[PDB]
């Protein structure tokens, strides 16, 4: 086949460029952010991802800066990443070479839906165990990935493995720095983004995972919406009017306006018959109007809901085991340490 | 300006639904 | 209450321009596009909707141009439009004062959704006929809407009259006259569309409306997705993987490029056991591949789904008569004239 | 160049639904 060789730089590396060789070039994804292809390399014969997207050259790319510094089993990992040209002339491109990941948990939620079953309770466990994960890491570091939502959740149809994968949203968070509203995507953008707050915090990734797991015990997405006001509408319809205080912790400069008080629905009523309790109470702390009441990513790994993941006898439909789910380092349990008394279970730690 | 309209909408709206 | 007085233009009239004083006004939508305001007429204190955009003034509006022509029971009525001044000085805003509707199908069928209920067959029926009577009127003027959607159907909560709304995406398609691809909304737009045709036909409005009934019928969106791809993955999912043919007729640039064979899905299996065939027959024959082999909206209208409504006995939940569904004018008819043997009954021709 | 490219994710995403 028709070889390409490019001198790249590896990601979690020192800086030192190298030769690369890859084939079986395939556009598997374009966007007004820029296309993105398939590949083999050469070497490994591994499929990769490569996402090209035009840099200005005079500005620093946010999304690389941030991917080059992360390394987690539950994030996709940026290989290498090089310089090129191929949409209008006299201009640079970035290309992001990233690990491919066959499916998402969108597209395999979208199977469920239209085939009128349900996302088997085990695997929403596990990828909403690998989402917290991943966010207990980046929040670690002060980063906020701003844009969670099943899309944006690859797995691994066989191991079951999920990534966090498209930085391109995601900030640093510096207490006390002002930051853009009109941020993460429709569906999953917490209350305090929908009333402009600018002073938000990451807590508002974890509203968008609270969606998330909604979305996956529901059938479909928790709070539909074309317009901002239409969500806070169908939040409102389930969580009921938030409290003046409630309302002062997302934004105080709605602090009087006087809005009509409506009755919250029970979580109970919200989901089907046979949905698990645990699932619903780990849903009630996630979607909390007051982002500072929101349980953290580390917190909401250790709750009830995760049990099952923690029995030594656990398997997999398909009768492989889980994904490595304890292999907790320091970095990750820094927010809260004595929680790795529950975190990680007996038959793991010795 | 903005607090104010965005305000004014979502009461319209709420006061629709309740 | 501060009264506001304007020298506007009426909507159906010979442009003889009057003064027009209104109150209570009040925000009640804001958009990209404009803000919506609310008021009330003091002359018949009758509520009006005033949507207010910004206008370069060097060039005609089309939006208005193609309102100022219409007069339908089933679409809003444009009582007058003015021009004034209001965000970011030395610009003219152009007011568009609309008859103000309370609720829309959009919202309804959120109701039911959260509601875990189905909306009632009667309604769905009474909402689709309208819908199609409202495209039959605009296409016999040439004119296609291009944004069919739910949130662009107002309902009257009481007499359960339906009017189409927002024209500003409407434009007259000229046979022989390119247009752009990416018109209409995500979920409701045409294959042909996402295929990036730029000769299509008003027949996009048609497959807009069976999105919409499909939507009624199942409780949610037929048809999701994110990008373009996305959508056309989740049509053939439900139609199958269309032929070289039916390719050909929304874009000949794909005929040769050997797409999967994907198995249709029957229309049985996509909807609950409880949905009436007729439901599923004029959905099929709405959603088709070939643009020229979808039901026209006067045919649509004769369709057997609709005829409990050409019932004499037929009466509303809430015991009010149905609206006038048989005053179909000469204007009307001209696309098929022989269709008055059945769009009109008995009971009301005499 | 659009419609080879648009095609060509078309294809790789009915793949793996098939
Ligand atoms: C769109 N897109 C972005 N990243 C990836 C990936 N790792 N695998 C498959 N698709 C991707
Ligand atoms: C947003 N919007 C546009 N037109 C209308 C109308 N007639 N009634 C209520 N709302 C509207």
């Given at each position: 086949?028709?070889?390409?060789?490019?001198?790249?730089?590896?990601?979690?590396?020192?800086?030192?460029?190298?030769?690369?060789?890859?084939?079986?070039?395939?556009?598997?994804?374009?966007?007004?952010?820029?296309?993105?292809?398939?590949?083999?390399?050469?070497?490994?014969?591994?499929?990769?991802?490569?996402?090209?997207?035009?840099?200005?050259?005079?500005?620093?790319?946010?999304?690389?800066?941030?991917?080059?510094?992360?390394?987690?089993?539950?994030?996709?990992?940026?290989?290498?990443?090089?310089?090129?040209?191929?949409?209008?002339?006299?201009?640079?491109?970035?290309?992001?070479?990233?690990?491919?990941?066959?499916?998402?948990?969108?597209?395999?939620?979208?199977?469920?839906?239209?085939?009128?079953?349900?996302?088997?309770?085990?695997?929403?466990?596990?990828?909403?165990?690998?989402?917290?994960?991943?966010?207990?890491?980046?929040?670690?570091?002060?980063?906020?990935?701003?844009?969670?939502?099943?899309?944006?959740?690859?797995?691994?149809?066989?191991?079951?493995?999920?990534?966090?994968?498209?930085?391109?949203?995601?900030?640093?968070?510096?207490?006390?720095?002002?930051?853009?509203?009109?941020?993460?995507?429709?569906?999953?953008?917490?209350?305090?983004?929908?009333?402009?707050?600018?002073?938000?915090?990451?807590?508002?990734?974890?509203?968008?995972?609270?969606?998330?797991?909604?979305?996956?015990?529901?059938?479909?997405?928790?709070?539909?919406?074309?317009?901002?006001?239409?969500?806070?509408?169908?939040?409102?319809?389930?969580?009921?009017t938030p409290t003046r205080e409630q309302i002062r912790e997302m934004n105080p400069n709605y602090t009087?306006?006087?809005?009509?008080?409506?009755?919250?629905?029970?979580?109970?009523?919200?989901?089907?018959?046979?949905?698990?309790?645990?699932?619903?109470?780990?849903?009630?702390?996630?979607?909390?109007?007051?982002?500072?009441?929101?349980?953290?990513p580390l917190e909401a790994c250790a709750h009830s809901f995760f049990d099952e993941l923690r029995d030594?006898?656990?398997?997999?439909?398909?009768?492989?085991?889980?994904?490595?789910?304890?292999?907790?380092?320091?970095?990750?349990?820094?927010?809260?340490?004595?929680?790795?008394?529950?975190?990680?279970?007996?038959?793991?730690?010795? | 300006?903005?607090?104010?309209?965005?305000?004014?909408?979502?009461?319209?709206?709420?006061?629709?639904?309740?």
């Amino acid at each position: 086949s028709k070889v390409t060789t490019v001198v790249a730089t590896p990601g979690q590396g020192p800086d030192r460029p190298q030769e690369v060789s890859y084939t079986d070039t395939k556009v598997i994804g374009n966007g007004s952010f820029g296309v993105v292809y398939q590949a083999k390399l050469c070497d490994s014969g591994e499929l990769v991802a490569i996402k090209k997207v035009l840099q200005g050259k005079a500005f620093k790319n946010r999304e690389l800066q941030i991917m080059r510094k992360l390394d987690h089993c539950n994030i996709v990992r940026l290989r290498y990443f090089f310089y090129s040209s191929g949409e209008k002339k006299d201009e640079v491109y970035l290309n992001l070479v990233l690990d491919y990941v066959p499916a998402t948990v969108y597209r395999v939620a979208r199977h469920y839906s239209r085939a009128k079953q349900t996302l088997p309770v085990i695997y929403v466990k596990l990828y909403m165990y690998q989402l917290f994960r991943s966010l207990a890491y980046i929040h670690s570091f002060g980063i906020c990935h701003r844009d969670i939502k099943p899309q944006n959740l690859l797995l691994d149809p066989d191991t079951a493995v999920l990534k966090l994968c498209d930085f391109g949203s995601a900030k640093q968070l510096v207490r006390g720095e002002p930051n853009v509203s009109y941020i993460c995507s429709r569906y999953y953008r917490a209350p305090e983004l929908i009333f402009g707050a600018t002073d938000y915090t990451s807590s508002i990734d974890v509203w968008s995972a609270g969606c998330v797991l909604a979305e996956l015990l529901l059938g479909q997405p928790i709070f539909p919406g074309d317009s901002g006001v239409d969500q806070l509408v169908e939040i409102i319809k389930v969580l009921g009017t938030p409290t003046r205080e409630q309302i002062r912790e997302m934004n105080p400069n709605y602090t009087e306006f006087a809005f009509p008080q409506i009755k919250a629905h029970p979580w109970t009523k919200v989901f089907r018959p046979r949905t698990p309790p645990e699932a619903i109470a780990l849903c009630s702390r996630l979607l909390e109007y007051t982002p500072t009441a929101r349980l953290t990513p580390l917190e909401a790994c250790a709750h009830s809901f995760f049990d099952e993941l923690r029995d030594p006898n656990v398997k997999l439909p398909n009768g492989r085991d889980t994904p490595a789910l304890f292999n907790f380092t320091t970095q990750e349990l820094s927010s809260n340490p004595p929680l790795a008394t529950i975190l990680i279970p007996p038959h793991a730690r010795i | 300006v903005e607090p104010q309209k965005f305000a004014e909408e979502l009461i319209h709206r709420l006061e629709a639904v309740q």
